[PDB]
Amino acid sequence: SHMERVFVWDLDETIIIFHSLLTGTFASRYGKDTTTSVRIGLMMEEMIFNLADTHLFFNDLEDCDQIHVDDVSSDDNGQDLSTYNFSADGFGGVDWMRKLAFRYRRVKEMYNTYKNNVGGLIGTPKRETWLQLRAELEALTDLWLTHSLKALNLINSRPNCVNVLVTTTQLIPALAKVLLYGLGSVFPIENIYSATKTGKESCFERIMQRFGRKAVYVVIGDGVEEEQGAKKHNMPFWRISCHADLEALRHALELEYL
């Protein structure tokens, strides 16, 4: 009998500031040092891909534009992967399919066990240089992520609201990114979609198929792709282009009881 909202977020320049650190638009728009902006941007980049290659089988998975994490769970025998050896096991298209699923389920396990202990996944001294990086990044972005997190966690703690993520970034890199920015705990992994292949609207429709017509969808983002896909599917769109937009969204989130 309760009304139900599904919030479909964009990641880059919506929930997090990352790409605009490399192009200098954020530093330029908010009066920050561009040299520092790029240094930080690149350091994060290296961390995202290093984590992706080192722990998320990216060198392997890269050439596989899978939308969702469980898309090849058909070929998964559910065995234990604790002692399973991925390095030496082959790296065909049937028994090979079972090895794929093994890697993606293993990615899922890493995410869930480390979404709140990303420093334990990354280890030392990576953990330490990471906490320092997130510290310079928060300072430079005037606490942008702090602002997005307030909305994300309010949608999380609320019973009839759901957080969904649609990102143009590939799936593996997108998860390393989500983890490194501390979003792993706010986004259930089954709720992340890589629109790298199919496109944003394709993912948007797929998400509606999953949640139903009786739900109220809200597309949140800064770009044209999400806004346009939101229009074609006739879903309310909430544009974000400054810290104030996040503040407004958070405010709406706290006035309603479903």
14: nearest Cα among 185, 232, 165? 165
Smaller CB separation from Mg ion, 103 or 167: 167
Annotated active-site residue in 10, 65, 75, 89: 10
Task: Please say if 95 is a catalytic residue.
Answer: no
| Whether the Cβ atoms of residue 9 and residue 168 lie closer than 8 Å to each other | no
C-beta of 79 vs 241, nearer to Mg ion:
241
Strands 237-239 and 192-194: unpaired
**Is residue 201 a contact residue for Mg ion (CB under 5 A)?**
no
Which of 12, 184, 192, 240 touches Mg ion by CB under 5 A?
A: 12
Q: How many residues bind Mg ion (CB under 5 A)?
A: 5
> DSSP of 110-156, one letter per residue?
HHHHHTT-HHHHH-TTHHHHHHHHHHHHHHHTTSHHHHHHHHHHHHH
Residue among 93, 42, 46, 57 nearest 72 (CA)? 93
Determine if 182 is a binding residue for Mg ion (CB under 5 A): no
Distance between CA atoms of 6 and 78, rounded to whole angstroms? 30
Stretch binding Mg ion (CB under 5 A), from 23-31, 71-79, 129-137, 215-223: 215-223
- Considering only CA atoms, which of 223, 126, 107, 109 is closest in space to residue 176? 107
Give the nearest distance from C-beta 109 to Mg ion in angstroms. Answer: 29
Crossing angle (nearest 10°) for helices 34-55 and 126-140: 140
245 is in an annotated binding site: no
In the range 75-134, which residues lie near Mg ion by CB under 5 A?
Answer: none
Which of 150, 145, 137, 139 shows the shortest CA–CA distance to 182? 145
Alpha helices (H) along the chain: 19-22, 25-30, 34-55, 58-61, 96-114, 118-122, 126-140, 144-157, 171-180, 200-211, 224-232, 243-255
Of 10-18, 52-60, 126-134, 140-148, the segment contacting Mg ion by CB under 5 A is 10-18
Scanning 58-66, 189-197, 198-206, 222-230 for contacts with Mg ion by CB under 5 A, the matching segment is 222-230
Is 12 annotated to bind ligand? Answer: yes
- Separation between Cα atoms, residue 34 and residue 77, nearest integer Å: 50
Residue 16 vs 56, nearer CB to Mg ion: 16
Return the number of the residue (12 or 61) whose C-beta is nearest Mg ion: 12
Q: Is 12 a catalytic residue?
A: yes
Q: How far is the CB of 80 from Mg ion (least distance, A)?
A: 39
222 binds Mg ion (CB under 5 A): yes
Residue 13 binds Mg ion (CB under 5 A): yes
Q: Which of 223, 227, 242, 248 binds Mg ion (CB under 5 A)?
A: 223
Which residues of the shown chain bind Mg ion in the complex (CB under 5 A)? 10, 12-13, 222-223
Active site residues: 10, 12
- Binding-site members are 10, 12, 222
- Binding-site members for Mg(2+) are 10, 12, 222
